[PDB]
Each structure stands twice: as structure tokens, then as C-alpha cells.
Amino acid sequence: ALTNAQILAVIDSWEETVGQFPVITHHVPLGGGLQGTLHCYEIPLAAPYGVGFAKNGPTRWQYKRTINQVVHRWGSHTVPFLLEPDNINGKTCTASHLCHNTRCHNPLHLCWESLDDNKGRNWCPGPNGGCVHAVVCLRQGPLYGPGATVAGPQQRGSHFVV
Amino acid sequence: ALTNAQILAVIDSWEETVGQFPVITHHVPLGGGLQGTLHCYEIPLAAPYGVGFAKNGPTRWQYKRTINQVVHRWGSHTVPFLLEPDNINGKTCTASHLCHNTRCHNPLHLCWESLDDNKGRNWCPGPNGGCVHAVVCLRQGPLYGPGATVAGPQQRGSHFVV
DNA sequence: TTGACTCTCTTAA
DNA sequence: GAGAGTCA
DNA sequence: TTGACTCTCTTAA
DNA sequence: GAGAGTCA
Ligand SMILES: [Mg+2]
Ligand SMILES: [Mg+2]
Ligand SMILES: [Zn+2]
Ligand SMILES: [Zn+2]
Ligand SMILES: [Zn+2]
Ligand SMILES: [Zn+2]
């Protein structure tokens, strides 16, 4: 809604409902050959999802609340950050999953940062493998690794230098 | 269609033209506090770009050659890799700039890999900062660093546990 | 055969 | 990663 | 009011 | 990060 008290009330009912999502334990790589344990509060795969929740995409959901007879709606992972600036350096703030588990709505697994910072975590070495993120990663990104490059830098002639 | 010999001729004419693009010397971070030097062969900001080159987008260009009366066209950074597999692990191969300079067409600054591998380089610590890419980075990714997270994981109540 | 424009599409966040 | 509309 | 669906859009590779 | 069309 508009007031601070109204925003807090939305965050509180959101936390309460998400707090009832089935909790799944996920064992994850932390980097440095170590492994950790995360507890994700996962939104159901099909309706009903929970009071105020509806799916707008294969892995997109929205939280809806009627305040003064007028309905307000937000991306499902954005609610915890309603009181924070919605941009940083002219870039939109986005819900970033430290657990890299889209269905998870655990606010302890979420941060609010630019889409670039958000995507970048996919390749982070992890909390025990060299992560330098100021708001630290909970695990090594799923895409961290040597890659699978088909062909590297090369030239046929002698017109170029590195 | 085009024989291997014909493709080689296209790569050679491409190298010849790009070789004449302004060569710009850039001082870049390599990771681990070290600075390096990269020499980029940059396509002009406006027409004419060079023989065979035309702009199809703000920072997208194509290379075109007519052989035996049939017109052939390729993404401008894809020519060096015309004789390589065009997919890997079921993913389309894409032109990845080891120099992170879009206008650059120096083949010694390009590699051929999946879009995920491609993007991930934006956050790499660099060849002197811990890069683990099998086809090593030439520099530290422009987006590597602490990031600028606005708000971290948090909860108002006690419904959650990490 | 070529140059200089036009257009829409792909991926995963 | 987001926005909003259509029905019941 | 609340739920369960539908659509298209943004970003930067 | 891409493929393809128009026009002279
Ligand atoms: Mg994410
Ligand atoms: Mg790139
Ligand atoms: Zn989680
Ligand atoms: Zn990290
Ligand atoms: Zn370059
Ligand atoms: Zn690297």
C-alpha cells in the first residue's frame, strides 16, 4: 500500500504465508571442496500456492493484497524489499536468489541488487572458494567451472597481436 | 554448399579487412592487482565500416560475401569460427569477447562457446586473479568485484531459518 | 555484387 | 528478471 | 475479495 | 548473443 505501516503489514502477511511453504533441504557446493546445507521454503508446483499467490509464468509468481478496497500486486520475491530503494545507480533492483532455487521464497535466501549482480552469482566460486560479493553467496554458483569452449582465439595470417 | 576451401577464403578476406580497422591499445585489469595491455581492432562507429561490413543493430554487425552469384552473410564476430562445430552440449556456440569490447573484431580476442560460458566471463577474476576457464580469459571481467547490493537477506519475524 | 539501412528473434536472469 | 489483464 | 489462469515486457550477452 | 529483407 502507501504507508509504512501498510508496507510492513504486507511484508508480515507475506512472511507468514511463505513461512508455511514446504521446507526442502538442499545440500550444496560451497567452493573449496566443501559442502553446505540450505533450507528452501518452496512455493508449490501447482495451485493452490498460498494465500495471495498466483502463478503468472512457468517459474514466475505474484503476491496480491487488497488494501483500501484497491488491489496491489508485486513480483513474489520482491515483497521483502518493499521499503528499499527500487534502483541503484540507475539500474533496477531485482530479487536475487542466493540459493539459485527459483521456487524458493525464503527471504534469508534473497537479496536485492541489480540484474547484473543477480546474474553474476551464477558463476561465483562460492563462500569457501573465493567469493568477493559484499553480501556473501550462500553457495558456489551452478555455472561456475572451466566451461566448454569449442574454439579459442586464433588467426590464419599475421595481421593481429593480442 | 560452400566448400572448406571457399570458407577459408572468406575467413582470409575477413581477416584482411578487420586487420585494417583502427587498432586501439587498452590498459586492462588482469586480476591480482596486475595491469595488462590489449590491442583491439575496432569497427568504426558509423558507415563505412569496411569492405563486406554493415550494421544491423546499435552494436551488431554482419559480414557479407557473394560467391558464384549467391549472397552469404554471417554475424560479424562469427567468421573466425566457420570451420568449427556450431553447438556443444546441445547449446549454440556464440562469439565471446575475451576483451569485453563489442566493437573489437580481433580474432585473438574471441572464442567460440555457449552463451552461458560467454556471459560468465563478465564476472571472471581474470588470468592473474583465479580464472579457471579452460580457454583462459585475457583480462578480469568488467563486472567482477564486491557488487552493489542494496539489501541483503533478512526477515521481520522468525518464521525462517537459512 | 555491395553498401547502408530496415526488421524481429534467442537466452536466462 | 518484471509488468498487467481476464474471468470466476 | 481471492484464486487461477492469460498476455507481453526488460536486460545484456 | 543472432538471422533475414529492401533498394538502387
Ligand atoms: Mg538469480
Ligand atoms: Mg561476451
Ligand atoms: Zn532457497
Ligand atoms: Zn559470491
Ligand atoms: Zn579486443
Ligand atoms: Zn576466466
Side-chain angles (χ1 to χ4, degrees):
Chain A
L2 254 16
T3 74
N4 217 81
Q6 286 170 310
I7 295 320
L8 289 198
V10 175
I11 294 171
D12 280 345
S13 54
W14 178 95
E15 282 193 1
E16 174 95 61
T17 299
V18 173
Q20 296 315 114
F21 285 175
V23 176
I24 300 287
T25 300
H26 292 292
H27 298 277
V28 304
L30 296 173
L34 297 177
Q35 177 180 303
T37 302
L38 271 26
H39 304 98
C40 293
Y41 290 62
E42 311 181 338
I43 199 153
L45 275 168
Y49 308 97
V51 177
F53 291 91
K55 171 188 294 171
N56 50 316
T59 56
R60 298 295 311 169
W61 308 268
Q62 288 167 300
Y63 186 62
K64 181 169 75 175
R65 290 285 80 185
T66 292
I67 294 340
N68 276 143
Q69 254 198 305
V70 18
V71 356
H72 290 254
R73 187 161 47 169
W74 309 266
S76 67
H77 297 109
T78 77
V79 181
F81 312 109
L82 259 24
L83 256 7
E84 306 284 335
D86 65 20
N87 70 105
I88 175 65
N89 292 140
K91 302 164 183 315
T92 299
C93 283
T94 66
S96 178
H97 284 266
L98 261 11
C99 59
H100 296 283
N101 180 4
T102 316
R103 283 175 54 205
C104 177
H105 284 70
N106 186 343
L108 294 189
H109 286 184
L110 298 172
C111 67
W112 195 232
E113 51 189 10
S114 73
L115 187 60
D116 270 345
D117 277 353
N118 191 333
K119 282 164 188 174
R121 289 188 194 260
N122 288 350
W123 294 273
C124 190
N128 291 78
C131 166
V132 295
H133 280 104
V135 166
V136 72
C137 280
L138 287 182
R139 56 110 92 209
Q140 171 177 95
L143 268 23
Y144 165 91
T149 306
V150 166
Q154 56 203 275
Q155 72 179 314
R156 299 229 329 133
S158 48
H159 290 305
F160 308 100
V161 298
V162 178
Chain B
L2 291 190
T3 64
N4 289 339
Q6 291 182 297
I7 292 293
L8 274 193
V10 165
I11 292 172
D12 284 344
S13 70
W14 179 93
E15 285 195 0
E16 235 227 68
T17 299
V18 172
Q20 302 174 67
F21 283 179
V23 194
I24 310 296
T25 302
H26 301 286
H27 292 294
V28 301
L30 304 170
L34 293 184
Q35 232 54 27
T37 307
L38 256 31
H39 305 93
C40 295
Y41 290 68
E42 309 180 349
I43 201 160
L45 285 167
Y49 306 100
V51 176
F53 289 94
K55 164 186 292 171
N56 52 314
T59 51
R60 296 296 313 167
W61 309 266
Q62 287 168 297
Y63 186 66
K64 179 218 301 186
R65 290 287 80 177
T66 304
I67 291 100
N68 294 332
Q69 298 218 95
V70 11
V71 177
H72 290 270
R73 187 162 40 169
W74 307 268
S76 71
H77 298 105
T78 76
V79 180
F81 312 110
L82 261 16
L83 267 349
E84 314 288 335
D86 56 276
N87 61 57
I88 181 66
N89 294 142
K91 299 164 200 294
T92 199
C93 286
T94 63
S96 174
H97 281 83
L98 266 0
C99 62
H100 298 276
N101 182 3
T102 316
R103 282 170 64 205
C104 176
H105 282 71
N106 180 348
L108 289 190
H109 286 186
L110 300 164
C111 61
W112 197 230
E113 56 193 9
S114 78
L115 187 61
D116 266 345
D117 280 352
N118 193 328
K119 300 179 166 152
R121 294 201 190 250
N122 287 353
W123 298 276
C124 190
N128 278 274
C131 165
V132 294
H133 283 108
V135 164
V136 75
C137 280
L138 285 183
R139 57 157 288 173
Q140 176 181 90
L143 269 21
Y144 165 87
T149 306
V150 167
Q154 58 191 258
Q155 72 179 318
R156 282 191 32 94
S158 66
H159 300 284
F160 308 96
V161 107
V162 308

Short mmCIF file of all heavy atoms in Angstrom, two decimals, chain B residues 121 124 131-133 137, ligand 6:
data_model
loop_
_atom_site.label_atom_id
_atom_site.label_comp_id
_atom_site.label_asym_id
_atom_site.label_seq_id
_atom_site.Cartn_x
_atom_site.Cartn_y
_atom_site.Cartn_z
N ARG B 121 31.99 -14.83 -18.38
CA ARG B 121 33.28 -14.16 -18.39
C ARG B 121 33.21 -12.73 -17.86
O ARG B 121 34.22 -12.15 -17.46
CB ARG B 121 33.88 -14.21 -19.80
CG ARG B 121 34.22 -15.64 -20.22
CD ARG B 121 35.25 -15.68 -21.33
NE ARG B 121 35.40 -17.03 -21.89
CZ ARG B 121 36.47 -17.79 -21.73
NH1 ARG B 121 37.49 -17.35 -21.01
NH2 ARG B 121 36.52 -18.99 -22.27
N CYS B 124 34.52 -12.96 -14.36
CA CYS B 124 35.74 -13.67 -14.03
C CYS B 124 36.83 -12.82 -13.35
O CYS B 124 37.04 -11.66 -13.70
CB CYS B 124 36.34 -14.34 -15.26
SG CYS B 124 37.69 -15.45 -14.83
N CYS B 131 41.20 -17.13 -12.60
CA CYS B 131 40.42 -17.66 -13.71
C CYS B 131 40.57 -19.19 -13.86
O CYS B 131 41.69 -19.71 -13.86
CB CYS B 131 40.83 -16.95 -15.00
SG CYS B 131 40.25 -17.78 -16.51
N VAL B 132 39.46 -19.91 -13.98
CA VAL B 132 39.53 -21.36 -14.14
C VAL B 132 39.01 -21.83 -15.52
O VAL B 132 38.91 -23.02 -15.79
CB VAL B 132 38.74 -22.11 -13.01
CG1 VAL B 132 39.43 -21.87 -11.69
CG2 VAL B 132 37.28 -21.62 -12.94
N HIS B 133 38.68 -20.87 -16.38
CA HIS B 133 38.21 -21.20 -17.72
C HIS B 133 39.32 -21.98 -18.45
O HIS B 133 40.47 -21.53 -18.46
CB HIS B 133 37.90 -19.90 -18.48
CG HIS B 133 36.60 -19.25 -18.08
ND1 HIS B 133 36.53 -18.09 -17.34
CD2 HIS B 133 35.32 -19.62 -18.31
CE1 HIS B 133 35.27 -17.77 -17.14
NE2 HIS B 133 34.51 -18.68 -17.72
N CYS B 137 40.89 -16.44 -19.78
CA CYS B 137 40.50 -15.07 -20.01
C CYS B 137 41.75 -14.24 -20.27
O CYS B 137 42.84 -14.57 -19.78
CB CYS B 137 39.78 -14.50 -18.77
SG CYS B 137 38.01 -14.98 -18.61
ZN ZN G 6 38.11 -16.62 -16.86
#
